[PDB]
C-alpha cells in the first residue's frame with residue numbers, strides 16, 4: 361500500500377515530499393491515458409480530467425507540456441527536455457566470422 | 462533532436478502549489494539531483510561501444526582464424542613427432 | 555603501425571617467440587634431424603644438430619620478414635612447423651599491405667575527443683571557461699566525478715586557461731589547442747560562421763532562456779500560452795534556422 | 808578491395824539524409840504525438856517525411 | 859668483407875636476399891631490424907601506388 365511503485369517519477373516525488381511538506385498518496389488513473397480532447401463532446405480523458413475535476417492533485421508523470429493542455433491545466437517548469445529522434449539499427453558490421461582471410 | 466518539448470508536474474487550473482514546485486525543481490537541477498536520477502534509471506548496463514567503434518584496424522575478429530590454423534599445424538606436427546620417432550625405433554629391432 | 559590493431563602486434567610477437575621455441579623442442583627430440591659436419595669419415599659420435607636456441611629464434615624472425623634463412627628443416631616433424639609458419643606470414647603481410655592500401659585511398663579524419671569524458675583525462679589539451687560566468691559557476695558547485703576533475707585543472711590553472719571573454723576565448727582556440735566551454739546556442743552560431751570550428755560532445759547542463767515578467771504578473775500566463783502555440787506550428791524553428799544559419803558550410807577531400 | 812569498400816561506406820546521420828532515401832522506411836506511432844507533429848509541420852524536410 | 863656488407867644491404871632491400879646469413883647475436887640484430895625496415899618501406903610503396 362503506497363509502496364507498489366518505483367521509478368524515476370517516484371524518486372522525483374520523494375525529494376519533492378522532502379523539501380516541500382506533504383505525504384504522497386499515489387493513485388493510478390482509471391483510463392490509463394495521458395490526456396487528449398475528445399472531439400465529439402470536448403470532454404478530456406485520462407490524467408488531465410482528474411486534474412480539472414480536482415479528484416487528483418498532482419500529475420508527476422510523462423505529461424508533455426503542450427498548447428491544448430496549458431489552457432485547461434497549468435504545468436510547472438520542465439524537469440526534463442526531450443525531442444523526436446530517430447531509432448535505427450547499428451551498422452551490421454560485415455559479419456566476418458573468424459576465417460575472413 | 463527534431464522537436465523540443467518537455468515533461469511537467471501537472472497542477473489544477475490556478476493552483477498555488479504550482480509555484481512552489483517551480484521553485485523546487487530548479488533547486489534540484491543546480492545541485493544535480495535529477496542528473497543523478499537520470500543516470501540511475503536510463504543507465505544500468507555499460508555497453509560495448511569501445512570494443513569495436515568500426516575497428517579501423519585488423520583484429521582477432523577479422524584475422525584471428527590464422528592463429529587457429531597455426532595452432533592446428535603445431536598439434537599435428539607433434540603427433541607426427543611421436544609417430545616418426547616410433548618408426549625409427551621399430552627399425553632398430 | 556596503424557593497419558594492424560595493437561592486439562595483433564602483441565599476438566604476432568608472442569607467436570614469433572612461440573613457434574620458434576616449439577621448433578626448437580621438436581628438432582632436438584626428432585631422430586631424423588641429425589646430420590654430420592664433414593662426411594669424409596662417415597662414423598658416429600660426430601653426429602650433431604643445427605637447430606640451436608639462437609638459430610630457432612632466427613628461423614622465426616627470418617621467415618616472418620620474407621627474407622628466409624639457412625636452416626631448411628629435414629624431417630616431417632619439423633617441416634610442418636616450417637610449412638604452417640610460412641602460410642602464417644603471408645596472411646599477416648598481405649593483410650598489412652591490403653589494409654594500408656585502404657587507409658591511403660580513403661581518409662576518414664577522426665577527432666581526438668568525442669565527449670567531456672574523453673577530455674577529462676588528457677590534460678595536454680587545455681580546458682577553459684568564461685571567468686566567473688555561468689559556465690565557471692557550474693563546475694565549481696558540481697559533484698559529478700567527471701566534472702569535479704575538470705574543475706581541478708581550472709582551479710590550478712587560473713589566469714592561464716581562464717579567459718575573461720568569449721571573443722578572446724574563440725581566438726584562443728584559433729591560436730592553440732584550446733577546448734573552451736560555453737553555452738550551446740552561441741556555439742551553433744560560431745560554427746555556422748566559422749568553418750575551422752566544431753561542436754564536439756552533446757550537452758552538459760540543461761537550462762533554458764525565458765521571457766521575464768515581474769513578480770506575480772498576470773501576463774506571464776498569456777505568454778506561457780503564446781510560446782507553446784508557436785512551437786507546435788514551427789514559428790521558432792523557422793527563426794532559429796534564420797539567424798543561427800545563414801551560410802551553408804563546406805569541407806571536401 | 809574488401810578493406811576499402813568497407814571503409815568508404817558511411818551510414819545516415821540526420822533526418823535530412825533520411826529524407827531522400829525512400830529505400831529505408833520511415834515510421835511513427837499511430838496517431839500519437841510524433842505522427843501529430845509531421846502532419847502539422849510546414850518545414851521542407853518534415854513535410855516530405857509525411858508524404 | 860666491405861663489398862659483401864654492401865651486398866647484404868642491397869640484397870635484403872630488394873626482397874631477394876643473399877648468402878651471408880650472420881651467425882652471432884651481435885650481427886643478427888642488425889640483420890633482424892633491417893629486414894623489418896625493408897618491409898615497411900616496400901609495403902608502403904605498394905600501398906601508396908595503389
Ligand SMILES: CCCCCCCC/C=C/CCCCCCCC(=O)O[C@@H](COC(=O)CCCCCCCCCCCCCCC)COP(=O)([O-])OCC[N+](C)(C)C
Pocket residue numbers: 457458521522525528529532533535536537565568569572
Ligand atoms: C601446443 C600449444 C597449444 C596452446 C593452446 C592454448 C592457447 C594459447 C595459444 C597459443 C598460440 C600462439 C599464440 C597466439 C595467442 C594469441 C591469443 C589468441 O589468438 O586468442 C584467440 C584464440 O586463438 C588461440 O590462440 C588459441 C587456439 C587454440 C587451438 C589449439 C589447437 C587445437 C586445434 C585442433 C587441431 C585438430 C587437428 C586435425 C586437423 C589435422 C582468440 O580467438 P577466439 O576468441 O577463440 O575466436 C572467436 C571469434 N570472435 C572473437 C569474434 C568471437
Ligand SMILES: CCCCCCCC/C=C\CCCCCCCC(=O)O[C@@H](COC(=O)CCCCCCCCCCCCCCC)COP(=O)([O-])OCC[N+](C)(C)C
Pocket residue numbers: 458529530533534537541634637638
Ligand atoms: C606428404 C603429405 C601427403 C598428404 C597431404 C594431405 C594431408 C592432410 C591431413 C590433415 C589436413 C586436415 C583435414 C581434416 C579435416 C579438417 C576438419 C577438422 O576437424 O579440423 C578441426 C581443427 O582444424 C582447424 O583448426 C582448422 C583448419 C583445418 C585443418 C587443416 C590445417 C592445415 C595444416 C597443414 C599441415 C600439413 C599436413 C601434414 C600431414 C602429415 C576443425 O576446426 P574447428 O573445431 O572447427 O575450429 C574451432 C574454431 N572456433 C573455436 C572459433 C569455433
Ligand SMILES: CCCCCCCC/C=C\CCCCCCCC(=O)O[C@@H](COC(=O)CCCCCCCCCCCCCCC)COP(=O)([O-])OCC[N+](C)(C)C
Pocket residue numbers: 555560563564566567611612615618619646647650883886887890891894897898
Ligand atoms: C610487416 C609487419 C608484420 C611482420 C613483421 C612483424 C614484426 C614483429 C611483430 C610485432 C612487433 C612490432 C610492434 C611491437 C609491439 C607493439 C608495441 C607498440 O605498439 O609500439 C611501441 C613502439 O615500439 C615499437 O614498435 C618497437 C618494435 C618494432 C619491431 C622491432 C623488431 C622486432 C622483430 C624481431 C627482430 C629481433 C632480432 C632478433 C635476432 C635473433 C609503442 O610505441 P608507440 O605506440 O609507437 O608510440 C606512438 C603512439 N602512436 C602509435 C599511437 C602514435
Ligand SMILES: *[C@@H]1O[C@H](CO)[C@@H](O[C@@H]2O[C@H](CO)[C@@H](O[C@@H]3O[C@H](CO)[C@@H](O)[C@H](O[C@@H]4O[C@H](CO)[C@@H](O)[C@H](O)[C@@H]4O)[C@@H]3O)[C@H](O)[C@H]2NC(C)=O)[C@H](O)[C@H]1NC(C)=O
Pocket residue numbers: 728729730
Ligand atoms: C590544421 O590544424 C592545426 C591545429 O593545430 C591548425 O593550427 C595551427 O597549429 C600551429 C601549431 O600546431 C599553430 O602555430 C603556432 O601556435 C602558437 C601557439 O603556441 C601560436 O601562438 C602561433 O599562431 C600565431 O598566432 C598569432 C596570434 O597571436 C596569429 O596572429 C598568427 O597568424 C599565428 O597564427 C603559431 O603559429 C598555429 O597558430 C595554428 N593555427 C593556424 C591558423 O595556423 C592548422 O592551421 C590547420 N591547418 C590547416 C591547413 O587547416
Ligand SMILES: *[C@@H]1O[C@H](CO)[C@@H](O)[C@H](O)[C@H]1NC(C)=O
Pocket residue numbers: 749750
Ligand atoms: C581555416 O584555417 C586555414 C588555416 O589553417 C585558413 O587557410 C582558411 O582560410 C580557414 N577557413 C576555411 C573556411 O577553411
